[PDB]
Amino acid sequence: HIDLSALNPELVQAVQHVVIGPSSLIVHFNEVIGRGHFGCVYHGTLLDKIHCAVKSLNRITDIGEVSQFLTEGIIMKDFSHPNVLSLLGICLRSEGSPLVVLPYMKHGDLRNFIRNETHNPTVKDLIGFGLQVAKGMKFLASKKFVHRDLAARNCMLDEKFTVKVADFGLARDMYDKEFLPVKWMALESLQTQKFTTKSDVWSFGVLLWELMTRGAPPYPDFDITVYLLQGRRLLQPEYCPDPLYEVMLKCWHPKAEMRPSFSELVSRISAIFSTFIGEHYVHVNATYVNVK
Would you tell me how many other CB atoms lie within 10 Å of the CB of residue 114?
23
Q: Where are the alpha helices (DSSP H) in 47-194?
A: 63-77, 110-115, 123-142, 187-192
Quick note: the x/- pattern for Cl ion over 116-135, rule CB under 5 A, is ------xxx-----------
Dump the DSSP string for 262-277.
HHHHHHHHHHHHHT--
Among candidate residues 149, 167, 173, 200, the one labeled active-site is 149
User: Which of 154, 189, 197, 213 is close enough to bind ligand 3QT by CB under 6 A?
Assistant: 154
Quick note: the x/- pattern for Cl ion over 64-103, rule CB under 5 A, is ----------------------------------------
Does residue 241 bind Cl ion (CB under 5 A)?
no
Active site residue 149: yes
Does residue 203 bind ligand 3QT (CB under 6 A)?
no
Query: Is the distance from CB of 233 to CB of 252 less than 8 angstroms?
Result: yes
Q: Kindly tell me which of 139 and 239 has the beta carbon lying closer to Cl ion.
A: 239
User: Would you give the DSSP letter of residue 22?
Assistant: G
CA 72 to CA 252: how far, in whole Å? 32
Query: Is the distance from CB of 90 to CB of 101 less than 8 angstroms?
Result: yes
User: Does the annotation place 34 within a ligand binding site?
Assistant: yes
Which of Cl ion, ligand 3QT, none has residue 123 at its interface (CB below 5 to 8 Å by kind)? Cl ion
Q: Kindly tell me which of 178 and 279 has the beta carbon lying closer to Cl ion.
A: 279
Beta partners for 253?
none
Diameter of the chain measured on Cα atoms? 61
CA 292 to CA 286: how far, in whole Å? 14
Query: Binding site: what residues are annotated?
Result: 33-41, 55
Site of interaction with ligand 3QT (CB under 6 A): 33-34, 41, 53, 85, 102, 104-105, 108-109, 112, 153-154, 156, 166-167, 171, 175-176
Query: Binding site for ATP: what residues are annotated?
Result: 33-41, 55
